[PDB]
Write a protein that binds this ligand. Sequence first.
Ligand SMILES: OC[C@H]1O[C@@H](O[C@H]2[C@H](O)[C@@H](O)[C@H](O)O[C@@H]2CO)[C@H](O)[C@@H](O)[C@@H]1O
Ligand SMILES: [Ca+2]
Length: 161
Amino acid sequence: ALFKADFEDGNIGNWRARGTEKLEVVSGIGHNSNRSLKTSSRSETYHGPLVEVLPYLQKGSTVHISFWAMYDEGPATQVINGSLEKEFNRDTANLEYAMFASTTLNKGQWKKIEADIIVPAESTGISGLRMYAETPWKQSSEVTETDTIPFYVDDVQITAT
Ligand SMILES: OC[C@H]1O[C@@H](O[C@H]2[C@H](O)[C@@H](O)[C@H](O)O[C@@H]2CO)[C@H](O)[C@@H](O)[C@@H]1O
Ligand SMILES: [Ca+2]
């Protein structure tokens, strides 16, 4: 594996919020394990746990990203997306965002979200590439409670192809 996070050491590492939401490594909740990363206090669909992965990866390569997700409150089902945040030429004012995978989860059950992704080449000037999880986009005025449910992620992995 190029990158692995199972949270079993209880460390947040380099995982971060995207806005005003709360990240916590919790104990007693996990995918076949005792620990996982909970994201709560979400008030936008795009709030979710994020980590910078570009340093783990070769520019120009194709890699396989997977993670497990779960939520246990609110609707019977809900879509979780796996997405990328990209920065070019250290321009923090013009980030790009792309979804790489999406699954419909059932309340209370862990499910795997995965895809191949392309790491842009050096000659793009790519300077950040961060994986994150989120719910499907909605404008702030249309956002409802079901959209902003807390959720867990675990067993994050990036593999060579
Ligand atoms: O709708 C496009 C895109 O928005 C991304 O969220 C941005 C938000 O649009 C921006 O105004 C705010 O200041 O920062 C956040 C990111 O933390 C969102 O991440 C994408 O899922 C969405 O496709
Ligand atoms: Ca775990």
